[PDB]
């Protein structure tokens, strides 16, 4: 019932060509053990520059988003086919910025994930509740609904769930500095784990990785990483900084 | 009251790395006179590959979309800053696939265009009505509304309108093979021209370029290109093929 630690860095809409070259080189120069998964997600226009700068045998490059159709008449959108042609294994789907600011629906996120998973990618599937939703006592209702939408698309497929990494990021913690307490985070992760047991049964559930995000940084990650159901982190702001490497180290010696 | 001919090729969600290299090289090998603007818009993940393959002193690379915020927490989105850092001058905004399939609102398209124009880019701003809208006799009402949204953001700014290229693409003509007749297209373009006269006055209006798109190809472009208010084309499917170069030639000898 053991799971490989995972840390992802979401650069979001940040970076210049020079920054991508210099920052990817810095991360690639860091010692990354073979025991943990480390990925970084540059902006789409920077993926090929990042791949060229990535001299690490461990670090992987991920995309921040992908569309729910194959190649075709989808102006402004990227297909799974394009990502795989570039050699990428990982993609972030359902980030709360896309759900809450850009109108990506629960079904849209689920259909994106399904298509990527079917084609063999690993999907970092994001869920999370807003401050108001938590205030209304709907935290689990909201997170479960987002997962249920995925479940509707994936059913109980062994193949499909294998390469899902759930990222729980309370929306009130994203970019705000208001990191969840270890108790708040673990509480939600236990709820999600229980949901997985019901949907794919106990064995299937034991291997689903759940990472935390929302103001995770070099200074606060250790205590969170000690929680049994927190398998690692999705890191936004700190992923643009040297402290990202500190987080890699900490996740390693903790888990 | 004369305007430089313009042809843009929108690759949409198509291409592999090898295809971008080979197809951009083929277009770049073609003779392009200094008298016309020729741009191609690869998918975002392919922009840097396209730039590297573009050995032409005339051909320009454009983006298919851009977001309405600067760098920041906008997962999956590209900023104007990123495009300019990569050396791009042109971007497509408001393509009807984004408006009609992906929920991009008239205001969102307008705000994207305004931000790009303020920063110095040339924006290919797309407008168009659906078959049902035309059937309901609302063709001009719809197209004008889309333009009015832009006008609300740009006002009567001389600086801002200077680098707008309007692309009229009837939605019923996009990817369907059902190209507009020269009469249908010119009729709408005259309506748009009249609108510009009212909004920015006659002088400002005389320099706004209006291109046609929607099943424009190597075989049907000549007659359309002969229309006084059709300053060129936005080309989807044919832009992925050798006939794109034929269209460049035709636009040149016609206008």
Residue numbers in the entry:
A (entry chain A), B (entry chain A): 2 to 256
Q: Can you provide the manuscript's text about this entry?
A:
TIM is a ubiquitous glycolytic enzyme whose active site and overall α8/β8 barrel domain structure are highly conserved; even so, structural differences in its interface region have been used to achieve specific inhibition of enzymes in parasites. Since Giardia lacks oxidative phosphorylation and depends on glycolysis as its major ATP source, it has been proposed that disrupting this pathway could hinder the survival of the parasite; therefore, glycolytic enzymes have been considered potential pharmacological targets. Our results indicated that derivatization of C222, a non-interfacial residue located near the surface of the protein and 10-15 Å away from the active site, specifically inactivates the enzyme. C222 is at the end of loop 7, with its lateral chain positioned in a hydrophobic pocket formed mainly by carbon atoms of residues N218, G219, E223, F234, M248, and I251.
The relevance of polarity or charge in the inactivation of GlTIM by modification of C222 became apparent when cysteine was replaced by asparagine or aspartic acid (their volumes are similar to that of cysteine, but the former is polar and the other is negatively charged). The Ki of C222V matched the Ki for the WT enzyme, whereas the Ki values for C222M and C222N were, respectively, 3.7 and 6.4 fold higher; C222F showed a Ki that is 17-fold higher than that of WT GlTIM. WTC and C222NC produced high-resolution structures (1.6Å and 1.45Å, respectively), whereas C222DC was solved at a resolution of 2.7Å. In all cases the final maps were of good quality, as indicated by inspection of double difference maps. Remarkably, initial refinement stages yielded immediate interesting results; even though the three proteins were crystallized in presence of 2-PG 5 mM, only the WTC and C222NC structures displayed electronic densities that corresponded to bound ligand in the catalytic site. The structural comparison between WTC and C222NC showed that these structures are almost identical with a Cα RMSD of 0.38 Å2. The larger differences were observed in the region of residues 198-207, which corresponds to a small mobile loop in the middle of helix 6. In both structures the architecture of the catalytic site is conserved; the ligand is positioned correctly and the geometry of the active site residues is preserved. The result is intriguing because the perturbations in catalysis and stability of C222N do not reflect on discernible structural changes in the crystallographic structure. Thus, it is possible that the presence of bound ligand stabilizes the catalytically competent conformation of the active site, masking or preventing the conformational perturbations induced by modification of C222 with MMTS.
